[PDB]
């Protein structure tokens, strides 16, 4: 089997990327954040404390004939940037891109911290880190990925995301329409649950490649990218009035520049960041002053190639038995 399913921005800005669920039966049709850097399923749903949900699409298992209670199990998550949600867990029937999985674990938000309250566009999250990471207990469960694996052709999932513009998510086959020249695997560690692997260097705008390895998880769950404070110092040098701002929380750049494009290593090939995609428009709105999208990751303990880098390339995540990352330019 396979699956195919557009995944569209949810705002000017690419801040995330909302791909469309069926749950249940009759189809509730969600649309959830997939997430690499995480291994939960869950959604906002009719159990969701009512103040804490302003204009989302919720689950109802009660109006599905398929969903059943999985008795005692309860989940409860904190993202990397201080959001949290927490609830109770159904089984019941999904579906992404026309790939059906009978039996997942679906969790059911009863509480979501501000930042998912205030976030009309995303329903929920689809998580496809390693199952390793689930919240669930106490019998942890296995994300959509892992439980497809066994039934596609091939056991892969790809990410093409898109600058500025859909893009796609597939499961079970690598379209070798998407992307140009040929795709560039990498060793993964599975050791912290991620899609941790190393890229061998950078290179600023058109300057000479730094040979140096960079240890970081592709992570399509988080909007920028978070690399060594040397690199990130090294990058944003070259634009004139460029600064790191403790007061807005990472780098600022006049919004009159023209930023240069940055490249990182996959093995002997290199992926080309352009320029215009590090940019994050206005700190607030009418502002001269631009957010960066490329940061320091001094503060958070791992190095995190996110949506300013992934959507740059067609990533193929490979979980064969041993699991491996690949990287095409596109």
């Not at 009719?46 to 689950?59: L, P």
């Not at 469960?141 to 796609?168: C, I, W």
């Not at 950078?202 to 060594?228: E, M, N």
Request: a negative charge; one cysteine or more; glycine letters at 12%.
């Amino acid at each position: 089997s396979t699956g195919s399913a557009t995944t569209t921005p949810i705002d000017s800005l690419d801040d995330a990327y909302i791909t469309p669920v069926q749950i249940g039966t009759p189809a509730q049709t969600l649309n959830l954040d997939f997430d690499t850097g995480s291994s939960d399923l869950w959604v906002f749903s009719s159990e969701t404390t009512a103040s804490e949900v302003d204009g989302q699409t919720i689950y109802t298992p009660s109006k599905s004939t398929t969903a059943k209670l999985l008795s005692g199990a309860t989940w409860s998550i904190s993202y990397g940037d201080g959001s949290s949600s927490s609830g109770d867990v159904y089984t019941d029937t999904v579906s992404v891109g026309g790939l059906t999985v009978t039996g997942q674990a679906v969790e059911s938000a009863k509480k979501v911290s501000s930042s998912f309250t205030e976030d009309s566009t995303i329903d929920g999250l689809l998580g496809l880190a390693f199952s390793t990471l689930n919240t669930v207990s106490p019998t942890q469960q296995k994300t959509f990925f892992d439980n497809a694996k066994a039934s596609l052709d091939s056991p892969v999932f790809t990410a093409d995301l898109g600058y500025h513009a859909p893009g796609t998510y597939n499961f079970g086959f690598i379209d070798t329409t998407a992307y140009t020249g040929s795709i560039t695997y990498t060793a993964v560690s599975t050791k912290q649950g991620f899609w941790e692997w190393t890229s061998t260097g950078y290179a600023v705008g058109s300057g000479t490649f730094k040979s140096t390895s960079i240890d970081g998880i592709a992570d399509t769950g988080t909007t920028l990218l978070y690399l060594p404070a040397t690199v990130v110092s090294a990058y944003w040098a070259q634009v004139s009035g460029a600064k790191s701002s403790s007061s807005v929380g990472g780098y600022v750049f006049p919004c009159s520049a023209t930023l240069p494009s940055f490249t990182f290593g996959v093995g002997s090939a290199r992926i080309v960041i352009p320029g215009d995609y590090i940019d994050f428009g206005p700190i607030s709105t009418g502002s001269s002053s631009c957010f960066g999208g490329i940061q320091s990751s001094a503060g958070i303990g791992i190095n995190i190639f996110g949506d300013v880098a992934l959507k740059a390339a067609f990533v193929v995540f490979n979980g064969a038995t041993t699991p491996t990352l690949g990287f095409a330019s596109k």
